[PDB]
Structure formats: structure tokens, C-alpha cells
Nucleic acid binder design. Structure first.
Lengths: 246, 91, 61
RNA sequence: GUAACGCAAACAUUGGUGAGAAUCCAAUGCCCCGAAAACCUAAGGGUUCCUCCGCAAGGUUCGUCCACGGAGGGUGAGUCAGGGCCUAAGAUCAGGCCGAAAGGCGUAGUCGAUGGACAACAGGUGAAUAUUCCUGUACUACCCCUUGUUGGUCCCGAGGGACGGAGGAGGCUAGGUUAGCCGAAAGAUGGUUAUCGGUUCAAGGACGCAAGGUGAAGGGGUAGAGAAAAUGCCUCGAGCCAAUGUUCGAGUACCAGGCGCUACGGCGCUGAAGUAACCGAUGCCAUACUCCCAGGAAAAGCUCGAACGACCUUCAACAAAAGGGUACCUGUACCCGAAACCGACACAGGUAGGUAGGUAGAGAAUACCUAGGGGCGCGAGACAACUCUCUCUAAGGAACUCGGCAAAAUAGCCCCGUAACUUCGGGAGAAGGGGUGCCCCCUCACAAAGGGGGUCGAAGUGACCAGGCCCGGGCGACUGUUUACCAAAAACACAGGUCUCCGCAAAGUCGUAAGACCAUGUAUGGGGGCUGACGCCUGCCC
RNA sequence: GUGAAACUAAGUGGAGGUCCGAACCGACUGAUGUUGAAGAAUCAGCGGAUGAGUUGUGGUUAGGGGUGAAAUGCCACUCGA
RNA sequence: AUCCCGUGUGAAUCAGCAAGGACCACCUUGCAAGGCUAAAUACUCCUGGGUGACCGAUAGCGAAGUAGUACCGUGAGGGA
RNA sequence: GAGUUGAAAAUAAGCAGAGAUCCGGAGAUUCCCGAAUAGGUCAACCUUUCGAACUUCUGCUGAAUCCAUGGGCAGGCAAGAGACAACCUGGCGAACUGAAACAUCUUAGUAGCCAGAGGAAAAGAAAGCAAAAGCGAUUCCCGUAGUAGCGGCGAGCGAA
């Protein structure tokens, strides 16, 4: 195993300056990092699954592949798959669960994942547990995809995608059950707004118990949370997006 | 390239003359001296052997808290430190 | 009580104190270099207290 | 000339020293500490350590004494600790980007142990050091020489180093106890030897593993860009892995006790027995086993190895063998549960780690003790009020008072017994009762058992130690957190719920910028608002 | 005990922000202390005490700031700057 | 007005260009978009020479003594 | 040109008319730290291969592409770096205060920080003044004058 490397960034709520920009982090448990090939760019080399194991750094499980020529890679476990199953990346290849193939040659309407937005990079979309995309159409240079959010988006057709839904569908059936469970998961407590003083947070102060008194529900930094968009405006990708979410 | 720090020909300041040193001459067959603070064991053994033409089983050194290095220079079973030190005015 | 109170000092290694306030620290920073200017100007005997030798007698290994 | 003289462990006497002694030294009593008030370390102090002298000042009194003043001394290392090796958090950052200047980001590297990697033990000695000096017996790294192979060396591609918590059983030892063996023995009193002591030995070398665990540990060739990892072949006195143990180390010492010193300290000669049984660790096996999920550092040293690319190359590089020969820097004193650090004080305070004896006990609690260390730097009387720290109290038993605040009572173990309600886990040690000392007995296996019988006291967990319990309501579900130095809660958090934003060059956040977090994550994810387990719910108004 | 599940009696097992209780960490009540022995202590009791646990070493965050299970609390006996 | 600047525009060449406190005409003055240059002027950590209706140890420099010392502060710093 | 071997002043041994001690000018040495510079560091130490590190000078080389640039190896007395009371040039640039409050305004382009250099620095040889009369690069004093002016026409500011 040369894929399981202890090379954390450490602290990991703190920026370059050294201030807590991303809030409610720390405590946690020490964890390692499994590199995962989201590219799956070992082309025309026939592969075999061997073990399904726990990634501490994810929702979904990881799958250890042994290739025919004799090298090993970690990937995302698809839903139906088991130990000793078979896969391959390339152009031709069948549409059997867990195989990798560019979006052009794929069927119309198949549950898929690990999709690139830009050719070359790797695999950004549908990576969580139960992640699932459904190719709706195709148009010239583009393929029209429906995402896990419930949004239809034009992406480039030459881009890669791995067939099958992503496994471990039941991780919504946790109850955690106690403060301590979320504490050792990495997260930390979240102090409400209305509780604090006026100097700290917009809702702050107020004698007795405070109603959220200032006409709007506010962030810590003045910008109305609870209804108000924030998708820049005239962003580069704007053209490509077709729909909303749910 | 020999010395950690180059110092001098000189090095050795003087022998210590006291009641402990006289007894250590008889018991251990060993001389006692004050040297450079920047003096090395290797440097001392090359000096004292090459000076008197005598052998040195071992040197052991310390820095008394003012910052002056004092060295015990031990001699082989062959060479006799009592008679050697007699002809350098310690007896 | 069992936790002592309002002793600002403790017994802490001269390593850490020299890496916080020592000569080599002051000498790096431009702002901090002009503190040594003021110290030599006033003519204070000991410039920056809390300096240690890597060598013996006051070594903090 | 008052308050005070820093705990209520505790002193007394005889002698000595000297101008002078409650206070300095010695002896004898007595008492106190003993998971310390003992002995070691890390940090920090910074000469306080030892010797001889002094007592103006300092020491809450005195003082011939001192952590005080003067004078002189004292810290010895290949193996202990660090550095000459390695890297984490973090730091600095060549070129590079960004910024009025100062500078900011950031890769290659380089630093940076609290971690990895590495070689020593006993006995001895001495005013002050000892794993450092001495004696014995060891080990690591280099330079000789006998065999060798033809290249080495670095870069470089691999193996490996290499890692969690919890729990439990087994095998061992360290340590303890008892016996045996040996030596000594009047301790003035009815008896009595039943008494008192000693019975010790490390590192390392050589060598084997059991009803301890397991039943591939460890290899050898081969294909395919392939020397390692990986797809198929075979083979294993079917066995391995270890802590302990047998020996040498160690016919040596070490040694209880005897036989002589001469004045205030140890020191010469001698030298018996040196075993067994049981209890037994939080120590080792064990980076072992099982279980669990929150999924448990890196880098060098080490071992392979084939390349390519460089150097160093035939007075040479790598392997093995006994015997030789060789051996850098710094720390080392002393205090370190404190009169020496940190608290302005010789301050009732704080301060990381190590070693853990006996009797009673479940126990690192407690009580009394051992080894070891101490009697708290004002004393002497007297025995008024009053205050404090305590001990008891006839009759009553909350009548006190803002309030049972405070005090009292309960208490260990074994056996019987245990309600409403319930989220079916609880409530619950519910409540409430009975037995416990000491002696003597039944049993081819019930930690003074269990049971039977006796005997003593007013009282049997007799001391220390060691739950008070119940019924009803508000708030918050719950363990948790909070105003250091007046507020610990009903306040915050919490699992759960809901809304809203965000499709990745993401929203958000921090920055003049570069860019950083988010995330090496990508909608079962990430940011924000409110509510606060769980049950039933959550209406009208745009 | 079942078509098999379900369910239920005994063993085994060692979970738990489980219980009682030293060290450890805290700070609820009282008494004492108030030109204190102490610029927050002593004493007698108290809560947690395998976890959201305690703590040594070495680091990080900086005042139009930081940090904050949120009191305007803490940031060297200083904090509405 | 004159002088200098970000943004955008954008001339002319001595029948020229600019100034003469918007602006135009006529006069007068000068030659912008390249550089260099002593003096008179400013000051005292300091050296030499002189002077004082200046101080004389609570004054005069903080500092007449081995003072930025002793001491305090984590530190900048304060300070006999 | 006569006694000396620093201050406090004591001893011990020396050096001195063949001219010391001293005074002046010029040279030589100058451990370690510090711009610090062989590399590291917790200033005054540790490791070395014993080295001015880094940049522009100057000799050769030879990247991704011909040339070229980056880069590597050499020689180099080798120019630069840091320090410095005030004065000065340039960059950034306050607030208290005054206006009896306060925002224009004033405090002020002052204090502060940052960078730079000299004995001064900056300025400076007319695309300038001025008025039909003339002057001839700067800079500083007297003056014009608290005048012309500007100004919530307020406080104030104030030329040539």
C-alpha cells in the first residue's frame, strides 16, 4: 500500500494569515489520506476488484483495484458491486456497472458518476455516497446531464464518466445520537446569533430573550441569509446551465 | 584539516598544584593541567605526547564554571608520572 | 487553589524564550532592528535580555 | 514599647564548645511524616556544593550556627543526556508571483523533539564527582592482516521502518511472606528461646522452549515493457513466535557475626550458611490476542535491486575471520512534593516524569509502622471575660430561621425483600428487614467458607474508614460548558427538526493584490437563519 | 419453537458522553481568614473522574485586532477595545 | 489663469509655439516636453580657541562615586 | 632630554646617557559575535570540503528552440551592502485641538513611520518678471504688509 499516505494539511480551519476563516473545525480524530484516481486514465488495461474498505475522509466507500499487468489503484465503490468483480477504462468497453468511458459513446439515460466538467482534470461531479447522474440528451459538442441536485447542465461530450450509481446509499440512517459523536467526527459547536452581544453578531444583544428583530435574517456579516441569490451574475458558465434545482 | 578551532602552539596554561592533584599523580598515574577553553582532547594529546615524548592512554576534560578548561591527562603503565612531574617542579 | 493564580511567569525553557525575544529574532525584522538602534542609542549595557548560547553553561538542550 | 513573631508533629534531659547557649555539636529518651515531610530526575535557578575562618548587617527572638560575610577548593564519559543522523507541528524560503516603502504569498530545499535511529554493567574509592576515576567482565564504530570478486560511490526504482482505543485470558518475573540452614542471644519481672540477625549478586556470551499462543513465520526459480509488486506452478525431520529458564560471567566476591584499634572518625584481620515452598503485580511477553468504530504521523538508519546519468578507478571498492591497534563538541556541582524554581518574604500556596516495603483492607483510601527523613528559627508562665478549632450534654425534638443554613443520624460485607410510573434500557443500593466478635467442629475441594454447637461484652463493619430516605410541583431532556477574583443556573452547547444559499474557476470567509481557507471536499457535500431528545401537533392574515 | 422467520430459557460476552470511589481536574455550601500564613487561601464537607477527559514539551492566531459550547468573558494581578 | 497628475483623445514647428489671472483681437516677453553646476543658507553626537548681571550637589545633563548603573518589567520600556 | 614598567601604588624583576618612559606623523597586528558573507544556529557557539554569501563587472561554456535568455564552472582586492546627533531630499501621512457644538475649514502637509545622500541638501541658467518704462539663473536677510487678496466672507489663511 503506497496509496495510504499521512500527509495532512493540519489545523484545517485556518488560512495563510492563521485565522479561523472556515468556522467550527478542530478536535476530530487523527486521519490519513487515501489517494483516489478520479481520472481513471489507465486506458485499455483490464482491472479486477479485490477489497471494499472504509475511507475516513468520505461518505462513500473506497474500492481497491488490481490491474492485469500488475499495479493497484483506489477508486469509488459503485452500488451493486462486490469483491472479485471486474472493470476497465477506455473508449469501447461495455456498460457494465463500474466501468469507465467517455460520455459520447454512452447510452441515453444511464445512472453514472465521477463526471469531469473539463477534459483532462479528473472527476468532480457525483462523488458522494449515493451520487447518481442521468444523461438526458446530447447536442453537437455538448452532452446534457441531470445532476444529483436536480439540475440539468450542458457539459462537454468528450468528458469522462464512470457507469453505475455510487454505493453506501444508507448513510442517512445514522442518528449520531449524542454531542460527542459529532465532536469526534471533526465538527465543533455552533453558537446561535440572537444569543451573542451586539458587538459580535447582527442579531446580538436584546434584553431577555431576543426575537430576530432587524427586519431581515442576517449572516454574521450583514448579507441577508434566508432568501437572496449569490451566483455571481454574468459568470463564465452561465450559458451552459439549463435548469434550477428542486 | 585538524583543529575544530585553530588556537595556537601554546594551549597549555599551567599545571594545577594542589592536594588532590598530588594524590592523583600517585593513584591514577595521571597529570592535571589547565588548557585553552577552545582546546580539544585530540589537540591536548598531540601536544603533551609530542612535547615530553610520553604516551597518553586517555585525556578527560571539564570546564570549571568560570570558563577555564581543566584536563586530566592519563599516562600508560610504562611511563612514570611521579618522576616525570618531579622534574617539572610539582614535587 | 490547585490551579495557582496570577503568576504571569512560570519556569519555562530558555530555548522558547530566546526564540520569542532573542537576538537572532530581533535582528531579522526591520521594525525589530530599529529597537536595537534605540537600545544602542540609549546605551543600555545588556541589549535584549533572553538570549541563550547553543554551547554549554547556559545550554538548553 | 501596643498588635504581631507565619498551623495545635513535641519536645525533654546529660555532657561538650564558648566571654555568653531554650536555640550550635554529641548522646540518650520521646514524638511526627512514610503514594511523604523518602530517594532520583526534566525545566528553572546560577555557585547556593565542600573546607577553614567571621559574626557589623541579613535570619521575625537568641546564635559559638547558617542557603549570610571573607578566604581557598570542587563538576573527569566512545556506551548516560544532547549535537556531529532523521524528520512533524511550525518556521525561514533560492528562482517565481504580488505589493507606495516596510513587505505579503509560495515551490525546490534548509532548520525545528516533545517522536524515530543508534554501543556498559556490577562491585570499589572519596571533604565535595561518579553507568564519567579504580577493578573485573562487556559492547559500538573505524585502520591492520587471510580469503577473496571485479568494478565501486552516488543519484535512483522497490521492500521495510510504521504506529488507534477498549477489553479479557494465559505464561512469567520484580517484589513479598513463611520454612529450612547458619551465626548470635539474658534483654533483672510468673513463665519462657517460642528470641535477634544473615541467607545477596548486573550487563553481556553460549544454548533449548511447555496442555503459553497460533497450524502461512522463512524461502527457491519462472513468464508478461517487469530486477521488486501482481496471474498461474511446486516444496517444506508440518512447524513457528517469544518473556522466563540451564550455564559461564561468579573456585571471585558480597557477607551476619567475631578478634584489635585510640579519640570524637572509620579501619585492619577474620569470615558461617548462601536453599526451598507459597502469594504475586499497574512490570515483561505483547509494535501479541479478541472486539469496536470516531479508522489510528512523517523521514532517515536498515535490506533488496536491473536499468539510465554522472563521478571515484587498479599503492582500490564491497563480503567474511579470529587476534590486535585506535576512540570528536557540550552538559555533569547543589536545590529540584522546595528556606535555592514560580508566588516582592527563609510566604499554610503552584510545579512535568521515575521507584513503590509490612500489618490490617477490594484498594496508590484509611490507621499504625520499616527503610529514609524530620520536631515546623521567639520562648517562659498563668488558666479571667471574649473569639476561634474541637468534645460532651438531663426533658423536649425544628418550637430555630428568610430557609433544618449548620450540626446530628445513615454507612462495609452476606442473605431475604423491592411500589407508582416507564422511551421497557430504567426507576433501584428503591423502600423495608435480618445476620456479622471470639472459640470448637461436618467436606476425595462453597478465600475464617456454608452450616452446627459453645463463649464474652451495655455494644462485634466495635477504631479510622463508610449512602440518610421518602412524597409532590416549576425549568431544562439527558453527560457536558460559563462570568480566573461576588452570579454554575432556568443561561450556552447538545443529538433531532425545519428554511435558505451554493454545479465547482461553488457559495462563504480573510486579504490593496497575489493568493489562503473552504477541500486535496464536490449536493447523502459545503455555508448561513432559527428551533432544540422523545410523543402528539404547529391554525388565521401577503 | 416454527414451512423458515418471529419469539423465549440458560450459558458466554464486557458495551456504556454507565455506577461508587483515590490520583487527576474542578469550585456547590458553610466556617475561618479581612493593616491575612495567602492581592481568592485554610479547614470540613462537595461535582466529574474512559471522556465534549486531564496534562508535559514545541508551536499558531494580535488590538479599527484575535479568540470565545457566548459572560462583552479571556488575550501577562490591565479589557464595552 | 499659471504648475502637476489617472482616464480618454490628440496638434503645430519659428508665415511657428507658449505666457502676459476666463476668453478673443492687437502689442510685448520668452523659447517647454535632454541633462550638469560653486557661493551666500540650514544644523550640533562632535574638535580646538574664547566668553558668561549661567548652575553649584532637592541646582546643573537622568548621570560631580566603575549610570542608563542598582532596581522593576515576558517584552517594548521605565529608572533612582 | 631623565627617570620610568596605565588608575588606584604595595611587592617582585627589568629597562634606562651607546639615549629609554613620554609626545607627534606614518605603517604592522587586530581571537569570537555583529552588514556577517563556507553551512547551521537559541549573538559571542557548532559543523566542515577551510570557502567574500549574494548580486553588475570578466573568461569560458551551453537548456527546454536556430540566435538568444535562464543556468553551471572559473578567475578576481572585490565596486555595492551596514552604521551615523541634528540639518536636508523623496514616499506614505494622523488625531487631539481652534471654529466657544460640528461635517466645509483649522490643527498640517505638522507629528510619526519608511527610503535616500551630503557636508550642506535642494533649487538653478527664462517657453521668466513687468508694462509701454524697463529687468536679466538661482538661494538667503530687510522690506513692501499684516497691504492685495482667499474664507460655513466664520474661525482663520495671507502673497508678489
Amino acid at each position: 500500500n503506497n496509496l495510504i499516505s499521512g500527509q495532512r494539511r493540519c489545523g484545517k480551519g485556518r488560512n495563510a494569515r492563521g485565522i479561523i476563516t472556515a468556522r467550527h473545525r478542530g478536535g476530530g480524530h487523527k486521519r490519513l489520506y487515501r489517494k483516489i484516481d478520479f481520472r481513471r486514465n489507465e486506458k485499455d488495461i483490464y482491472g479486477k476488484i479485490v477489497t471494499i474498505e472504509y475511507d475516513p475522509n468520505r461518505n462513500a466507500y473506497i474500492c481497491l483495484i488490481h490491474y492485469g499487468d500488475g499495479e493497484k489503484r483506489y477508486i469509488l465503490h459503485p452500488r451493486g458491486a462486490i469483491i472479485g468483480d471486474t472493470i476497465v477504462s477506455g473508449t469501447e468497453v461495455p456498460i457494465k456497472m463500474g466501468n469507465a468511458l467517455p460520455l459520447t459513446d454512452m447510452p441515453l439515460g444511464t445512472a453514472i458518476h465521477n463526471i469531469e466538467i473539463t477534459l483532462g482534470r479528473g472527476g468532480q461531479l457525483a462523488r458522494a455516497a449515493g451520487a447518481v447522474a442521468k444523461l438526458i440528451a446530447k447536442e453537437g459538442k455538448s452532452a446534457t446531464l441531470k445532476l444529483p441536485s436536480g439540475e440539468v447542465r450542458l457539459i462537454s461530450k468528450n468528458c469522462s464518466a464512470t457507469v453505475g450509481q455510487v454505493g453506501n446509499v444508507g448513510v442517512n440512517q445514522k442518528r449520531l445520537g449524542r454531542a460527542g459523536s459529532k465532536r469526534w467526527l471533526g465538527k465543533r459547536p455552533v453558537v446561535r446569533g440572537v444569543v451573542m452581544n451586539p458587538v459580535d453578531h447582527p442579531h446580538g444583544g436584546g434584553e431577555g430573550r431576543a426575537p430576530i428583530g432587524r427586519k431581515s435574517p442576517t449572516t454574521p456579516w450583514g448579507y441577508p441569509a434566508l432568501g437572496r441569490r449569490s451566483r455571481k451574475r454574468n459568470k463564465y458558465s452561465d450559458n451552459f446551465i439549463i435548469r434550477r434545482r428542486s | 584539516y585538524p583543529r575544530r578551532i585553530l588556537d595556537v602552539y601554546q594551549i597549555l596554561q599551567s599545571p594545577i598544584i594542589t592536594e588532590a592533584a598530588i594524590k592523583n599523580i600517585a593513584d591514577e598515574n595521571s597529570l592535571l593541567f589547565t588548557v585553552d577553553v577552545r582546546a580539544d582532547k585530540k589537540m591536548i594529546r598531540e601536544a603533551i605526547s609530542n612535547f615530553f615524548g610520553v604516551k597518553v592512554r586517555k585525556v578527560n576534560t571539564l570546564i570549571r564554571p568560570d570558563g577555564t578548561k581543566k584536563a586530566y591527562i592519563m599516562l600508560n603503565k610504562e611511563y612514570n608520572a611521579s618522576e616525570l612531574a618531579k622534574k617539572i617542579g610539582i614535587f | 487553589g490547585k490551579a495557582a493564580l496570577c503568576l504571569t511567569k512560570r519556569s519555562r525553557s530558555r530555548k522558547s524564550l530566546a526564540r520569542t525575544h532573542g537576538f537572532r529574532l530581533r535582528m531579522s525584522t526591520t521594525s525589530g532592528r530599529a529597537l536595537l538602534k534605540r537600545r544602542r542609542a540609549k546605551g543600555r549595557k545588556i541589549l535584549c535580555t533572553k538570549t541563550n548560547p547553543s554551547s554549554g553553561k547556559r545550554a538548553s538542550p
